[PDB]
Amino acid sequence: GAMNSSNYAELFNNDIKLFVDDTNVYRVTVHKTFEGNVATKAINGCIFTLNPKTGHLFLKIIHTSVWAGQKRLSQLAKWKTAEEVSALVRSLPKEEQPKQIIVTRKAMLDPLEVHMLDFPNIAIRPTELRLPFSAAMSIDKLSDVVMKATEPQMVLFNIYDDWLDRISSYTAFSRLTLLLRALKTNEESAKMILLSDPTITIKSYHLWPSFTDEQWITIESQMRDLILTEYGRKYNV
Amino acid sequence: MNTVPFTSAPIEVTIGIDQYSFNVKENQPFHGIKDIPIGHVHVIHFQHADNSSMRYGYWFDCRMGNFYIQYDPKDGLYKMMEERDGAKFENIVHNFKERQMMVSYPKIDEDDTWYNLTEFVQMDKIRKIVRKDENQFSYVDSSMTTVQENELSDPAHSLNYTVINFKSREAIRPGHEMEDFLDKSYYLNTVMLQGIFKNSSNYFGELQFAFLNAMFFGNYGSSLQWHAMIELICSSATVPKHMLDKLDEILYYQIKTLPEQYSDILLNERVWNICLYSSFQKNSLHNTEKIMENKYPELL
Ligand SMILES: O=C(/C=N/C(=O)c1ccccc1)NO
């Protein structure tokens, strides 16, 4: 069934699963035309496919060219996502294919389900969680490779950097969703928080800064503050 | 005009013949039904006065033999049987007609309802859906499940309707996933019409049979099948024009005939609103949409 707070530890067990988020697959800027009408120009997108246990991010870049000459792009995008996820599963050895794929938006269920009819044993599941994966394009190095791509391309990132060396998956995921929730609620503040101290660098092979355990608690506390705050500022409390 | 004689009516029962029905009291001197129109399939059905649970009945065609009804006090139901001795059958019927112990199938002459509800229904096809090859007539009741219901437990007593499943490899061509899911014309025209049903008449006959089993027995898996077969057409962008016109007529009379009080359980709000207002064929069911909106606007 659907994935919610009650069955949250199932993510870190030893059944392979992937979250698929499609919120950044079809991205546009909206602008005025010379005739004073409105028009969209698509920009590069990405599928966020994530193993929550390992941190493996299979980042499929959706080059604007895939949209050329197509109608009903918001609908196509769901199918395109499903086709790309399906191709991914088929490319992985059997022992690495997911037992479950969990979609962050219910509109992806049917597209994925139809694309995966060949895999009756892979459960396609929604979730009730309001997960912040849309904020993945506020991670500078992910946005960079999406915006630079000149063709379709798959890029691999470990979204937890080296954290699993020191913490559990349950804690790595909880940090990731706190970071991304913060970035989604106020990107400037969130980023300021992460970078204020120039002595803490992001290794070339990482996405996030090399905080010590203690620095991560401070950071994590500051992100919680930010999220409470922005919530007040939003609801005046 | 043909006759279904009853040996007797030992238990109080409501007897349906096609869309008609009448009350028989316990040990009332009833000996059957006469003047049944030749040329159509028919259904005779039963709901006991005591146990309104289990509507049941028999699909038959009087051209395929001489049939009578006899109560079975061990199995507790009105059973249909064939009389092979044709002289014995004529003699029995004539005696009962002379003594006027029979109800007259009460067709009004202007009335084409039954024809319009059974236009494509053919006994031979019924017998493939209800497998009991030693009899020329077919038994259906409220509780029989369909082949596809069993796939989601007694196979001999099932309704072997054609399985329709919109999220199946049969329905979806590899590489046309989105195309085939959003426009089911491939599945209608190639898989089902050309491949399985052969023509639109056999397709329409299953659909009318499913509808009739749903209405007369409240057979749930029958209603599911009727709705699926409507949806598959309504969700195909490419449908022969003659099929849409006949579909509109078929459904029109189904909807006309449905009891007003049973609409809440026999009609699937989602399928109907989709078919009438969202689907490719939303503008192609003019008679069906007009009766639906004047008779069941609540559903819409
Ligand atoms: O070599 C490794 C790490 N492998 C990854 O981090 C990885 C990332 C994204 C996709 C696939 C693999 N094992 O410790």
Q: Which domains, and CATH codes, for chain A?
A: 9-163 (3.30.420.230), 164-237 (1.20.80.40)
Q: What is the DSSP string of A117-175?
A: TT-TTSEEE-B-----GGGGGGSHHHHHHHHH-SS-EEEEEETTTTGGGTS-HHHHHHH
Q: Which helix H or strand E contains A90, and what residues bound it?
A: helix A73-91
Residues B177 and B300 in one domain: yes
- Tell me the β-bridge partners of B43: B59
What region, left, alpha or beta, does residue A70 occupy, with left being phi > 0 and alpha being psi -120 to 50 degrees? beta
Interchain CB contact of A116 with B (< 8 Å)? no
Atom 1 (ligand 1) nearest CA: A158
Q: Pairing mode, if any, of strands B77-83 and B32-36?
A: unpaired
Instruction: Name B188's Cβ contacts closer than 8 Å, sequence gap at least 6.
Output: B232, B233, B236, B239
Which runs of consecutive H residues, i.e. helices, occur in B48-85? Answer: none
C-alpha separations of B136 from B4, B7, B14, B65, B144 in Å: 14, 19, 24, 8, 19
Which of B119, B143, B167 is a domain's end point? B143
The CATH number of whichever domain residue B217 belongs to comes to 1.25.40.550
B169: chain A residues, CB-CB within 8 Å: 117-118
CB atoms within 10 A of CB B135: 16
Among A88, A36, A35, smallest CA distance to A60 is for A88
CA angle B271, B276, B277 (to 5 degrees): 100
- Judge contact between B267 and B258, C-beta under 8 A: yes
Q: Provide residues with CB under 6 Å of ligand 1.
A: A 56, 58, 156, 158
Cβ within 8 Å, pair B177-A76? no
- Judge contact between B59 and B41, C-beta under 8 A: yes
Residues B182 and B293 in one domain: yes
Residues B109 and B243 in one domain: no
CB atoms within 10 A of CB B282: 14
- Judge contact between B44 and B16, C-beta under 8 A: yes
- Judge contact between A101 and A124, C-beta under 8 A: yes
Report the distance separating Cα A177 and Cα A8, nearest Å. Answer: 13
Among A145, B230, A15, B4, smallest CA distance to A7 is for A15
CB nearest to B172's CB, from A76, A83, A117: A117
Ligand 1 atom closest to residue A54's alpha carbon, by position in its atom list: 6
Structure tokens at B195: 């491949």
What is the number of alpha carbons within 13 Å of residue A46 lying toward its C-beta?
29
Q: In what order do the strands lie in the sheet with B13-17?
A: B20-24, B13-17, B42-48, B56-60, B138-141
Residues B89 and B206 in one domain: no
Atom 13 (ligand 1) nearest CA: A54
Residues B124 and B167 in one domain: no
Q: How many domains does chain B have?
A: 2
Chain breaks in chain B (C to N over 2.5 A) after: 152
CA quadruple A68, A73, A78, A80: dihedral, nearest 10: -10
What is the number of alpha carbons within 13 Å of residue A147 lying toward its C-beta?
9
Residues B118 and B190 in one domain: no
What is the 8-class DSSP label of residue A3? B
Which of B87, B117, B143 is a domain's end point? B143
- Judge contact between A104 and A20, C-beta under 8 A: yes
Among B45, B101, B105, smallest CA distance to B77 is for B45
Atom 14 (ligand 1) nearest CA: A54
Ligand 1 atom closest to residue A57's alpha carbon, by position in its atom list: 9
C-alpha separations of B120 from B115, B123, B204 in Å: 9, 10, 6
C-alpha separations of A14 from A40, A52, A163 in Å: 43, 11, 18
Specify the residue for token string 């309001």.
Answer: A130
Can you give the C-alpha Rg of chain B in angstroms? 20
Tell me the residue ranges of DSSP E strands in chain B: 2-5, 13-17, 20-24, 32-36, 42-48, 56-60, 66-72, 77-83, 103-104, 138-141
- Judge contact between B121 and B205, C-beta under 8 A: yes
Q: What is the DSSP string of B235-296?
A: T-S---HHHHHHHHHHHHHHHHHS-GGGHHHHS-HHHHHHHHHTSTTTTS-HHHHHHHHHH-
Q: How many helices (H) and strands (E) does chain B have?
A: 12, 10
CB atoms within 10 A of CB B157: 14
Among B182, B198, B257, smallest CA distance to B226 is for B257
Cβ within 8 Å, pair A115-B168? no
Cβ within 8 Å, pair A117-B178? no
Residues B165 and B293 in one domain: yes
Instruction: Determine the distance separating the centroid of ligand 1 and the alpha carbon of A159, expressed in angstroms.
Output: 10
Cβ within 8 Å, pair A76-B172? no
Local structure of A6: helix, strand or coil: helix
Q: Pairing mode, if any, of strands B2-5 and B32-36?
A: antiparallel
Instruction: Determine the distance separating the centroid of ligand 1 and the alpha carbon of A135, expressed in angstroms.
Output: 22
Report the distance separating Cα A134 and Cα B249, nearest Å. Answer: 50
Residues B258 and B217 in one domain: yes
Structure tokens at B12: 């109080």
Q: Which helix H or strand E contains A74, and what residues bound it?
A: helix A73-91
Interchain CB contact of B84 with A (< 8 Å)? no
Report the distance separating Cα B4 and Cα B136, nearest Å. Answer: 14
Interface test with A, best of B167, B169, B170, B177 (most A CBs within 10 A): B177
Instruction: Determine the distance separating the centroid of ligand 1 and the alpha carbon of A11, expressed in angstroms.
Output: 18
Cβ within 8 Å, pair A79-B177? yes
Residues B44 and B79 in one domain: yes
Instruction: Name A113's Cβ contacts closer than 8 Å, sequence gap at least 6.
Output: A124, B167
Cβ within 8 Å, pair B172-A111? no
Structure tokens at A217: 């608690």
CB atoms within 10 A of CB A120: 8
Domain hosting residue B110, numbered range = 1-143
Q: Which helix H or strand E contains A41, and what residues bound it?
A: strand A38-43
- Tell me the β-bridge partners of B82: B67
Instruction: Determine the distance separating the centroid of ligand 1 and the alpha carbon of A97, expressed in angstroms.
Output: 15
Report the distance separating Cα B201 and Cα B198, nearest Å. Answer: 9
Among A55, A57, A60, A52, smallest CA distance to A17 is for A52
Interface test with B, best of A79, A114, A115, A124 (most B CBs within 10 A): A114
Residues B244 and B289 in one domain: yes
Residues B257 and B180 in one domain: yes
C-alpha separations of B107 from B37, B59, B251 in Å: 8, 18, 21
Report the distance separating Cα A205 and Cα A183, nearest Å. Answer: 21
Structure tokens at A197: 């101290």
C-alpha separations of B215 from B18, B49, B131, B254, B295 in Å: 11, 19, 21, 9, 17
CB atoms within 10 A of CB B70: 13
How far is C-alpha B136 from the geometric centre of its chain's CA atoms? 17
The CATH number of whichever domain residue B101 belongs to comes to 2.60.34.20
Report the distance separating Cα A141 and Cα A194, nearest Å. Answer: 14
Report the distance separating Cα B95 and Cα B89, nearest Å. Answer: 10
Q: Which long-range contacts (CB under 8 A, 24 or more apart) does A163-167 make?
A: A163/A55, A164/A54, A164/A55, A166/A213
Which of B116, B143, B170 is a domain's end point? B143
Local structure of B152: helix, strand or coil: coil
Residues B169 and B285 in one domain: yes
